[PDB]
Design a protein around this nucleic acid. Structure first.
Length: 155
DNA sequence: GCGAAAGACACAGATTTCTCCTTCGCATATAGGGATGCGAAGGAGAAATCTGTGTCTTTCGCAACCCTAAACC
């Protein structure tokens, strides 16, 4: 049960929480930041009221989802230095990267992975989770959700 | 992930121009008659270039952001 804990913690009545659930995927702001060189970059960031409930959800789900020990990003007591200490005594090096990594994660694959771990959740939990952690670009009829970056729960 | 506004890609079809096909008319090298060969206009029917339609492609400064220093995504 996750909706009950959120309601209890933030003191939300039924109507206010229903409205927030409906209007959540559109409370984002899009802006540009300069590039080192020539160009620009585009970011999207949620509001203050949604950020502190996303942090709470992350704190609630952190001790139940396994993470591999070879990922040295957004992890406790890990940094660049521990990443570079692995290759400090080897000769040849090869580097690669993906293409639009963040916006290729969709709720279909998130729930597919979540079902395999054995954690069972009701329909209400799935509905609240889907409408709270995902972004909907385009018009109101897009019906497409992506994670984005600049949100405390994406990493 | 993708607003508005112009191009690329694929598939038809259309049209003016031209090039092959009659038809008989001529002609000129052999004393008139006949014949092998070529020239003149219609009359086709073929072909290259142009034009028109429908489905994608691209990537906005895109209601709703914080204000202490450095590095990364």
């Amino acid at each position: 049960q996750l909706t009950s804990k959120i309601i209890s913690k933030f003191n939300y009545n039924r109507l206010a929480f229903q409205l927030l659930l409906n209007e959540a995927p559109k409370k984002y702001k899009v802006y540009y930041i300069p590039k080192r060189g020539a160009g620009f970059r585009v970011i999207a960031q949620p509001t203050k009221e949604l950020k502190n409930v996303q942090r709470f959800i992350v704190s609630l789900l952190q001790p139940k989802l396994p993470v591999h020990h070879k990922a040295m990003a957004y992890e406790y007591k890990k940094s660049i230095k521990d990443n570079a200490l692995l290759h400090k005594d080897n000769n040849y090096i090869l580097k690669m990267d993906f293409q639009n990594f963040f916006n290729k994660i969709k709720p279909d694959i998130f729930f597919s992975k979540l079902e395999n771990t054995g954690l069972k959740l009701d329909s209400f939990d799935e509905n609240t989770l889907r409408n709270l952690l995902f972004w909907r670009p385009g018009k109101k009829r897009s019906t497409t959700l992506i994670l984005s970056v600049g949100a405390p729960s994406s990493p």
